[PDB]
Write a protein that binds this ligand. Structure first.
Ligand code: ZN
Length: 362
């Protein structure tokens, strides 16, 4: 019916106009840090990957939560796959034309993420002390995950991820991924694979067996491009007659998971599940439902139910392929325990049967 769902979207947007003030505060700090990082020998070519102000909001429940990614271009990269995981690689250099300033970040022959991150945190920490025009402090240490957490005016938090940039062709593991031919045409897919790919140092809970010095592929820039150009029609959501509910279904699905995680934060068995699992499942639904008529504004309740049931199927069958790397199973028994998915399945099933009481009125 979406009468309830519409009411949900209306309160989430009222908080995003309040964000614009804090968004400018993020940009000011980010621009300042980039200025210093460029003055460093190793971080000479750093910069923002995508739109700096108002970057990713992993939490939509928390407007104060901010996510930022820094790109560092390194040419002539030799990627060695780690144990056929297909999502994690070792970074090596080729031929050594001459020693690079990045040689201070490598152990043995592989490029160490720990060394690069350590100096990265030190340079940032040095700067926020020299900033008294804007009250900022650094959080420590969040388990060791690459994200550096800063806090502006004691209310908003900003996570800064350092990523490597490669303008070479996408790895072989992404060959059969990004299947958007029926949805966004083979031309667009081909254009997207011409874009550079990115490497991100491993998570806090990696989890083993990981050598601790491997890097994970990142295509968040492609995901954003798809989100802003989601329609089968080139004018989708550019006029009143083509206002689909794709983005809304993604928000509701992300907000559902967050509300569930907040509800069971004492057990910490929904913490493995992140907004990226939801985001991954959503892209698959878009692939299975490429027509814009399958995402009509009037069928918001019906469209959201499809996203829910598909996510349920992914839990039961324990299959959730990475949208770019097919052989990478996000819901594999090695990444998340089976009891966790069954727990999440039961909770979601309860929400579907009782018209999602966790959403509203609140
Ligand atoms: Zn649209």
């Amino acid at each position: 019916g979406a009468s309830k769902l519409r009411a949900v979207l209306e309160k989430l947007k009222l908080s995003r106009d309040d964000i614009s003030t804090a968004a400018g505060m993020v940009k000011g700090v980010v621009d300042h840090l980039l200025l210093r990082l460029k003055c460093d020998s190793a971080f000479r070519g750093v910069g923002l990957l995508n739109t700096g102000s108002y970057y990713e909001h992993v939490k939509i429940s928390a407007p104060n939560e901010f996510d930022v990614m820094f790109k560092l271009e390194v040419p002539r990269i030799q990627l060695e796959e780690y144990s056929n995981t297909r999502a994690y690689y070792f970074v090596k250099f080729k031929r050594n034309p001459k020693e690079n300033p990045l040689s201070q970040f490598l152990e043995g022959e592989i490029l160490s993420a720990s060394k690069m991150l350590s100096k990265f945190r030190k340079i940032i920490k040095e700067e926020i002390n020299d900033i008294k025009d804007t009250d900022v402090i650094m959080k420590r240490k969040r388990g060791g995950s690459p994200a550096v957490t800063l806090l502006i005016s004691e209310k908003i938090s900003v996570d800064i991820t350092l990523a490597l940039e490669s303008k070479s062709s996408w790895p072989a593991s992404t060959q059969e991924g990004l299947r958007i031919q029926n949805w966004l045409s083979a031309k667009v897919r081909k254009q997207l694979r011409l874009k550079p790919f990115y490497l991100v140092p491993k998570h806090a809970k990696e989890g083993n067996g990981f050598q601790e010095e491997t890097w994970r592929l990142s295509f968040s820039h492609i995901e954003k491009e798809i989100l802003n150009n989601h329609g089968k029609s080139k004018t989708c959501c550019e006029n009143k007659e083509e206002k689909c509910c794709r983005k809304d279904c993604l928000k509701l699905m992300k907000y559902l998971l967050e509300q569930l995680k907040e509800r069971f934060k004492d057990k910490k068995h929904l913490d493995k599940f992140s907004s990226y699992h939801v985001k991954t499942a959503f892209f698959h639904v878009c692939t299975q439902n490429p027509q814009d008529s399958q995402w009509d504004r009037k069928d918001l309740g019906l469209c959201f139910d499809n996203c829910v049931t598909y996510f349920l199927q992914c839990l039961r069958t324990e299959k959730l392929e990475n949208y770019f790397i097919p052989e990478f199973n996000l819901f594999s028994s090695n990444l998340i325990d089976k009891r966790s998915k069954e727990f999440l399945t039961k909770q979601i099933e309860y929400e579907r049967n009782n018209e999602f009481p966790v959403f509203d009125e609140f």
